[PDB]
Design a protein around this ligand. Sequence first.
Ligand SMILES: O=c1[nH]c(=O)c2[nH+]cn([C@@H]3O[C@H](COP(=O)(O)O)[C@@H](O)[C@H]3O)c2[nH]1
Ligand SMILES: O=c1[nH]c(=O)c2[nH+]cn([C@@H]3O[C@H](COP(=O)(O)O)[C@@H](O)[C@H]3O)c2[nH]1
Ligand SMILES: O=c1[nH]c(=O)c2[nH+]cn([C@@H]3O[C@H](COP(=O)(O)O)[C@@H](O)[C@H]3O)c2[nH]1
Ligand SMILES: O=c1[nH]c(=O)c2[nH+]cn([C@@H]3O[C@H](COP(=O)(O)O)[C@@H](O)[C@H]3O)c2[nH]1
Lengths: 483, 481, 487, 494
Amino acid sequence: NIHKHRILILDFGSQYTQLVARRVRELGVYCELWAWDVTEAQIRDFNPSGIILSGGPESTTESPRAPQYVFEAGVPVFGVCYGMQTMAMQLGYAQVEVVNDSALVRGIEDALTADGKPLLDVWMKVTAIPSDFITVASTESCPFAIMANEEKRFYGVQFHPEVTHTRQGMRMLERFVRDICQCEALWTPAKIIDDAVARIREQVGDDKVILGLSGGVDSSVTAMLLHRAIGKNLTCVFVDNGLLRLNEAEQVLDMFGDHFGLNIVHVPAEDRFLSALAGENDPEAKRKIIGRVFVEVFDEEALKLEDVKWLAQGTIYPDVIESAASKMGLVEPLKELFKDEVRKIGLELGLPYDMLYRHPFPGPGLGVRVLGEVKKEYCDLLRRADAIFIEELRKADLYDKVSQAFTVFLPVRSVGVMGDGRKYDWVVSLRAVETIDFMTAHWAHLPYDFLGRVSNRIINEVNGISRVVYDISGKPPATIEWE
Amino acid sequence: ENIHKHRILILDFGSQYTQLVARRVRELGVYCELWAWDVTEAQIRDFNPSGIILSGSPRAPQYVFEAGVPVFGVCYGMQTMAMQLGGHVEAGYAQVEVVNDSALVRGIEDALTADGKPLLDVWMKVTAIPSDFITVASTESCPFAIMANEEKRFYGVQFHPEVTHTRQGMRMLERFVRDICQCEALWTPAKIIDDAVARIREQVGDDKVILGLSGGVDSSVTAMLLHRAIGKNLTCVFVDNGLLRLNEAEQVLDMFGDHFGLNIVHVPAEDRFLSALAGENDPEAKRKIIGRVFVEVFDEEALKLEDVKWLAQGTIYPDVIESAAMGLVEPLKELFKDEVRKIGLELGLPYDMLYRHPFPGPGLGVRVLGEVKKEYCDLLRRADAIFIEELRKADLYDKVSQAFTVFLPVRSVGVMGDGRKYDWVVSLRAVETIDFMTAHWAHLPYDFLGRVSNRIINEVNGISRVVYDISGKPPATIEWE
Amino acid sequence: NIHKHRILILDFGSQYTQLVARRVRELGVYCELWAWDVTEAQIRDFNPSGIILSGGPESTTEENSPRAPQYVFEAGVPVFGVCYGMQTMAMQLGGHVEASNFGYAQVEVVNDSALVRGIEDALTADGKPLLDVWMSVTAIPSDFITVASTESCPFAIMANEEKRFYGVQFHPEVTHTRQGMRMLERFVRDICQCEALWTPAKIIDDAVARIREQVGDDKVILGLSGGVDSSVTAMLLHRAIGKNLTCVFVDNGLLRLNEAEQVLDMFGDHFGLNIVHVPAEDRFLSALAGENDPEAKRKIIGRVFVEVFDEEALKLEDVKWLAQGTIYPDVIESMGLVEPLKELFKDEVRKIGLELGLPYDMLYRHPFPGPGLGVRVLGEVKKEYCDLLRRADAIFIEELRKADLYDKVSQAFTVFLPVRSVGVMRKYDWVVSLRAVETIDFMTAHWAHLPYDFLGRVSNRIINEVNGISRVVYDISGKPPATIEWE
Amino acid sequence: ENIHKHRILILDFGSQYTQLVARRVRELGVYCELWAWDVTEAQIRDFNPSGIILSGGPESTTEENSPRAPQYVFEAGVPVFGVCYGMQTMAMQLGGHVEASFGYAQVEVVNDSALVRGIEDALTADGKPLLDVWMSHGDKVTAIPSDFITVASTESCPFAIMANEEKRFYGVQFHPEVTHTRQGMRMLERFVRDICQCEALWTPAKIIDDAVARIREQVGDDKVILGLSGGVDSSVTAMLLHRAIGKNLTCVFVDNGLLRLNEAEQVLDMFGDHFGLNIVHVPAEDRFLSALAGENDPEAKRKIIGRVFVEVFDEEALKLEDVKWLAQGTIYPDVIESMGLVEPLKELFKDEVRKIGLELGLPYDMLYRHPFPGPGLGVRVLGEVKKEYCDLLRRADAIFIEELRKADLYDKVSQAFTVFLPVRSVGVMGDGRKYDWVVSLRAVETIDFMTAHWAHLPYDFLGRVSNRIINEVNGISRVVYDISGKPPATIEWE
Ligand SMILES: O=c1[nH]c(=O)c2[nH+]cn([C@@H]3O[C@H](COP(=O)(O)O)[C@@H](O)[C@H]3O)c2[nH]1
Ligand SMILES: O=c1[nH]c(=O)c2[nH+]cn([C@@H]3O[C@H](COP(=O)(O)O)[C@@H](O)[C@H]3O)c2[nH]1
Ligand SMILES: O=c1[nH]c(=O)c2[nH+]cn([C@@H]3O[C@H](COP(=O)(O)O)[C@@H](O)[C@H]3O)c2[nH]1
Ligand SMILES: O=c1[nH]c(=O)c2[nH+]cn([C@@H]3O[C@H](COP(=O)(O)O)[C@@H](O)[C@H]3O)c2[nH]1
C-alpha cells in the first residue's frame, strides 16, 4: 500500500518546507506536511516511517519546538536548519568538511580535497550538540554543520538538501527516506492514480458525481480521475462565464467532450455573469459575484441531474495546507498531491502537456483583468489582445520562461493613428512575471523587439485598442494581477 | 556687417532631410532660408541667394539655373536638376568612385580604389546627365552619383551630405557654401544675438514689451534676448496653470526672477485651469480649455500693464516653415531649434534648461487621461520627477527625445505592508523621435525600468503600479491624448 | 538478474543511436547497441525483450543498403523503428519508401497505438492529439495502421499492434521530442514488459559479483589514472577483492598541478586502496627530451608508460589479471582482462561512481588526455614548461569554477606556447593559451564564448601570478577547422 | 599671416590630461606650446604667452619638493588659468593654502568671473547656477590669496573655482579639457579667445599655408628627400613638401618585406599614380629578410631594421645629387616626448595632422588608419623573421582588418593586427589532420602610452575571422586572440 511508508514533515515555517515535501514525493514516498504545533496523539496516528523538521525563521533562543514525541517515536528524524537547531536543545553557498562517518552522508562527497577529508557543496548558533550526538560535518562559520546520533538515527544539517544548490542534497534526502527510513518507493504517478481510482470507487460507488470543469490543471486531472473511476456517472459542468480566454469554451469542449468522451454539461453563462457584474467596479465585489454566480450555476446544473450525491473538486494538497492554517459529499482525488504530481498524473491519465503546464488562470478569469466594471466589449478586446500576446509568446519560446503571462484591459482612452490621426481607443497592459514565491514575483524582461512586435500586433490587429503598455512592476510592491 | 549678406536658398522638395540641410548650412555659419520648391522667379530674385540648394513631379523654378549663382542638387534636387537641363531619370551606405575633377569634391577623399582612384563614403536615379555636365562620381548601382556643370557651377549628388553617414558630407556642404558660393561665416551665435538685439531695439525702441514666459527653450531665449535689448521695458508673464512639472513655477521664477533679473508677473492659476477643466474628459476640449484659459489669463495681465505696445514670442523658423498655406516681436523666427539653444547658452541660460525635453503647451493636461484633477496632477508630478531624476542619473535623458509619465485613472492593487491597497497606475513613456510622424518607444534598460517603477510605487503615496508605454508611433502617438 | 530484461538496439548509423541506448539505460533497463548487420543466431543468443531499430543516414532506396535481420520481425518481441529504423521496417514488411536527397514538428495522432496511447502534447482545433517531436515513406505494410501524421510526413507513426511493431519518423531519444522519453519508456517498460533493475546500486552489486566469479582470490593489476573510468574501476575491484587489487599510479610529470598528491590522498589515504606510486617525472621528461614532433611525443609518452607499467607489473608476480576502465562506447567502437565498466556508458560510470562513494567534482571533471601536458606543451616538453602550464591551468580552472563555467564547457585547459612575449617589469616571458570548447560530437567542437571580463580576469591572474608567463591568449578556433587539443 | 602671434603657454604639471588641454586650445584655433613646469622665466619671456594655462598633475603642493610654476607665470601680466594642481599651485604661490586629501560634480557659481559668467549647466533648487564639471576629488585649496574671490564651490570644495579678476587669474578644481565637464570647452574658449584676446588664426588651412611658407623659405629651390611610408605623418609631410617645393621633393618608399599586404602598391598607387609625388620605390624585402635571418631577439631585430632602413635611405640619397634637405614627419608629441631638417608637423598634434591631411586631399581612411610600427611585421613575427611567415601574417592580417572594417569595428579599436607565433598546432584537413602555424589576433583600445585594454570583439566576429584565416590562409592551423591587457602585457608582442 502506497501510503504505508510515509514521512511526517514538520513545518517550522520555511518557504522551502513544501519543497522538502515535494522532494520526498519526487523520491517516491508519501509524506505529509503538518505544523510543528502537533500532538503526540497525531504523530502516533499518522505513524511516520521517519520525521523531517523543516527550516525556520524563528530561533530556538526564545519559540517553535518539536513535540517531544518526535524523538521518542523511534523513527529516524532529520532536522534541517531550524529543525537541526531544535533537535539540539530538545535532546548562500558553502562547503562542509565531513569529519565523521554518518548514515546520512557516508559516500556522499561533492569535492573531497581539503587534503584528507570529504567536502559537500551545500546551500546554508548551534554551540553544542546533545551528548549522544557526534559532529559529522563542519565549516568555518559553523563547526556544527552536520550532527548525528547515528544509533537513534537522528540527523542534523544546517543546510537545505531540498534545494538544488546543495549539489547532492537529493541524494541525502534519498538516503534518509529510502535507506535510513527503509521506505519503499511506491508513491509513483501510476500507483497514485490506482489509489485515486480505488478510493473514489469505494467512496462513491454507483452514485452520480458532478464536477466543475474549468479546463485548468486541477479540475482537469480531477475530471480524468473521476472519469477513469466511475465513467458516465461523472458529469462535468463547464461554465463559459463570459470571462474566459479566446476560444476557451471550444478548447475545453473539443478536449473533454470530444477527445476524452467526458459527460459535459456546457453552460453558456456569459450574459449572466456580465449581468451580475454590471456596474461593479470593486475588484473584491467582482470576485465574490463571479464566485457566487458559479456556485449558483453549478447548483442549478446539479438539480437538472438527479441522485447527484457528490461534488468533485480539484483540491490539491497545498490547498489543504492553507486550510490547515486555521448537502453533497466531497470527492477530492488531489487533496494529497502537489501541483507537479498533479501534472505528472495528468500526463499519465493522458491529458496533453500544453494544458498541464499552462500558466495558471484565475478562477474569476478576465474578471480580475478588466480594471473596474467588466463589459463584454472590454472582454472581447481583452481576449484578442491576450491571444496575440500568448501566440507571440509561444512563437518566441518565451511561454515557459515566465510563470504567468496575460494582458490587462485598462478602461482609459488614448489616442492612436487611424489614418488622419484622430481615433481614441482602449489601452491594454501586457503582464508577464517570473514567480518566486506566493509573496514575490519579478516582471519579465521580455525582449524589446518582442514586446514591440506584440504591441504593434495588438494595436494594428485589434479594433478598439490604440495603445499597449507593459507592466514593469514586480511583486512586491505590486502584485501579479492588477486587481 | 550684415550676417544675412551671404545666404543660401534651400528649396524643399519634400524630403525629411531638408531642415537637416538648412541646419547644416547654419552650422557652417551661413544664413540660409528653406522655401517650398514651388517658388517664383520673383520670390527667388528678391532673396538674392549667394547659392541655391535643392533637397531630396515637382520642379525647381527655371530661374534657379538662370540665376547665375552656384546650385547644389541633393537626391531629388540632383534628379530634378537633370530633368530640367536635358538629362534623364529612371526610378543605405555606399561608396562612389570620383571619376572627374570637380570644385565640389576636389580633395575630399574617403578611401582609394585598387586602381588608385578616390572614393567617398556616402549615404543614399539618374541615367543621363545634361550635355554640358560631366560625371564626377559614380558607383555600381548609381552610374551618375555626382554630376557637375563645372561652368554654371551646378552640382548634383545622389547621396545626402547633410547626414553624418556621408563621411565628409559636411565638408562638401562647407565646400559649396563657403568656397563655391563665396560665403563668409558671420552667422554665429554671438552675432545672431547682436543682430537680434539690434533688430529688437530698432523695431521696439523705448516701448514696453510683454512676453509669455512658459519656461521652455523658445520663450526663455526670447525673454533673454528681449531683456538684453530692452531690460526694464520687458514684462514676462509666467502662468502656473496647475499642469507643470514638479516645482516648475518655483524653478522658472527662481531662474528668471532672482537669477536673471527679469521682471516677471507670476500668475498662480492652478485652481483656475483645474476648475475650467473640472469634469472634462475629451482631450480636444481639455486642450481648447487650457489654451483658452491661457490667453484669458495672459490678456488679463496684459491689460494690467501700462503702455504695452508689443507681444514677444518664441516663434522659431520651423514655426515659420510649418506655417505654409498690438505689435509682434519674434526674435527667433529665423533660428532652428539647435541655434536657439546655442544662443541661449551664449545669453547665459543653463544647458539643462535649453536641452530639456519639450513639454507640451497643455502640459500634464494631456498626461492625466480624462478629467484632470489636482490629486492626479500631484501624483503625476511626483512620479514624473522620480522618472527624470533617474533618467538623468542613468545618462539616459540624453538618449531619448521625450520622456514623461502619463497618469492612468485606473485603480490597481499593490502591496501595503502585510496586505493590499488599491491605488492609481502611471505609465512611463519614453520615445526616440524620428520625425513629426515617427517615434520608437525607448528600449530603456530593464534594471533601470525596475528601479524607477519601484521608486515611484514606494515613494509616491497614491501610485501602486507602473507600466511602460511599449507602443511606437505609428500606430500610437507620443502623447497619450 | 539485471540483464534479464534487455533491449537489443540495432544501430543503422545514426548519430543519436548511443543516445537511444543511454535513454533505455536511464530508463532502468539493460540494452545493447549492435551494428545492424547481425544474424538470427546473434539475436536469439541475446534474447531481446524488445528490439529498437535506430535511425541512419543511408536510404532504403539504395542497392546494398542496411536492412534489419529478418528475424527482428520474427522474434515474437516488440520492435521499435526510429527514423531509418522505421523506414527499414516498413520496407522489409510490405510497404514503400520514396527517396529524397531535420526540424521541430507536430504530428497528429490519428489512431490508437500502445506506443503513443495517452501521450499528447496538444490538441488541434479539431480535438486531435498532437505530439511535439524532433522530425527527420509512401506506403506502410498492409497489416500496419497509420498512427500519426504530419503535412510533410504522411506516416509519422505506423504500427502493427498485434505484432507489436512500432515505427516513428522522429527521435524519441532527443529531448526536443517533448514526450520522447515517455514513448521510449512506454515501449520498454509497458510494451516490452521490462522491469527497471538496471540501477547504479544494482550494477555495482552485479559488477562486484562478476569480478569475484572471474578473479576470486587472484591478484589484479590496474593502471590508476585518476580519470573517471580508471577510478570507478578501481573502486569496483576494491569493493570486490580488496587487498588483492593493486593500482599503479604513474605520475609521468605531465599531469595537472598536484595531481599525484590528489590521486594518492584520495584513493590511497581515503579509499584505502593499495597504490604503488611511480614518481616518474624525470623518466618521461628524459625520454621526451628534444622531441618537438607531437606524433613522436605521443608515441614516446605511450612507450614509456607501458615500459613503466610493465616493470611495475613484473614486480608483483602471481598476478593474473589486469583491470581496465574500458566502457561500453570503447566496446562499440572496437594475465587476463577484467573490465567492470564494459557495459556502462559514461554517465552510468559517473552515476555508479557516486554510489561507490567517489567525489562529484572528480566524476564530472573534464577529460584529461592520456599524454596530459605532453600534448599541451607545444614542441619540446620540459619540466619548466609543464610547471608554468600547471600553475597557469590551475588559475584558469579555479577562476572557471568560481565563475560557475566548468559545467558550461566540455573541456578547459591551458596550452604552453614556446614563444617569447614582452610584458611590464619590460620582460620577455612565455605565452600560454586558454582553450575551452563545447564538444558537440566526436568531430565538432565550438570554442567557448567565455565572458570577456572573465577572460580578462583569468588573463591578468595568470600573467601577474605566474612568474614566467608574460602573455595569455584564447583559442578562438573551433573544431573544424582546428582540433580541440593543439597537438 | 602670423598665425602663432597669439599663443597660450601650457605648463605641464603631469596630468594625464595635459595633452588634451593643448589639443582643446588647438581645436579653438589658437596656437599653444606644452612645456614642463620647471621652465624658466627666461624661457617663458621668450615664448611671450598671450596667456598661461597651468595643468593638473598627480603631485601635491603640500609635499616637500612638489612642482611649482615659475613665479613669473603670475608676473607676466597675462591671464593665468590653473587646472587642479595648477589651481592649487596658483593658490600656494600667491598666499593661499592647500590641504592634502576623478568624478562628476556640480559646482555652484557664487560670484561673477570673466571665466564663467554666462556659463551655466543647471540651477540648484534654491535657484543658483551650477556647472557640471569633471573634478579631481583629491587635494583641496582651503585658503585663497588676499585679492582672490570664490567663483564656485561645493559643500566639499569651498574653492571649486577661484579668480583674481584684475590679474586675470583663474583656478578651477575640475578639468575643462575633458568632455565630462559639460561646458569645459566654452570655459577654455572663454579663457583663450576672450580673456587672453587670442584671435583664432590657428586653423588647418592656415597651418598648411604657414607650413608651406616655412618650407619654401627654409629650402627655397633646394632638393628635399623624404622617407615615405604611407603612414599618416610622412604622408602629410609629403603633401606639404609637394605643395611647397613640388618637383624638388623626392620621396623614398622602402618596401622592407615587413609591410602589410600589397602595401607597396597602395602606397605607390596613392602617392605616385594619384597624388603625383616623385617616389623612389626601393624593393628591399630580401635585403631586410637577409639582414634579419637568424635573429630571434626582438631588440636586435629592431636595431637591424632601423639600421638597414637607414643604409637604404642614405643610398637613395646618394643616388640624388644636391639633396640639401631631409624631411621627416615629426609631430609635436614627438618633440614633447623628447642634411638640413625640415619638419612641417613638429608643432601639430596627431588630430591636427589628420585634419590638415584631409585639407591636403588625403583620404580619410589612410589618415585614420591604425598606427603601424616602424619595424612592421618584424615585431609581429615572433622570433625569427622569414618571408614564409610574413606572407602568412600579411594574408592573416588583411583578412582580420577586412572583417574588422566590414563589421564597423575598425574604428572601435586603436590598434588591430595579427602576430605570427612560430608554434605549430594541429588542425583538420579533409578527413585526416594537418600541422601548421598559429597566428594571434591582437586588438586594443589604447587609453594612453602605458595603458591598453584588449577589445571585447564579438565572439561571432572572432569565430568568423578565425575560420577565414584558417580556411583561407595556407600555413595556419589555428588562430588565437590576445586577451592580455596593457599592463601587464604590451600592445605588441615583442
Ligand atoms: O483562482 C484565483 N482566483 C482569484 O481571485 C485570484 N486572484 C489572483 N489569483 C492568482 O494568484 C496568483 C498571485 O496573484 P497576485 O500576486 O495578484 O495575488 C496569480 O497566479 C493570480 O492569477 C487568483 N486565482
Ligand atoms: O505644445 C504642444 N501642445 C500639444 O497640445 C501637443 N500635443 C502633442 N505635442 C507634442 O507633439 C509631439 C508628438 O505628438 P504626438 O503626441 O501626437 O505624437 C511631442 O513632442 C508632444 O509632446 C504637443 N505639444
Ligand atoms: O586520452 C587521450 N589521449 C590522447 O592522446 C588524446 N588526444 C586528444 N584527446 C582528446 O580528444 C578530444 C579531441 O582531441 P582533438 O580534437 O585534438 O583530436 C579531446 O577530448 C582531447 O582531450 C586525447 N585523449
Ligand atoms: O616597439 C615599437 N617599435 C616601433 O618602432 C613602433 N612604432 C610604433 N609603435 C607603437 O608603439 C606602441 C607601444 O607598443 P607596446 O604596447 O608593445 O609597448 C604600440 O602602439 C606600437 O604599435 C612601435 N612600437
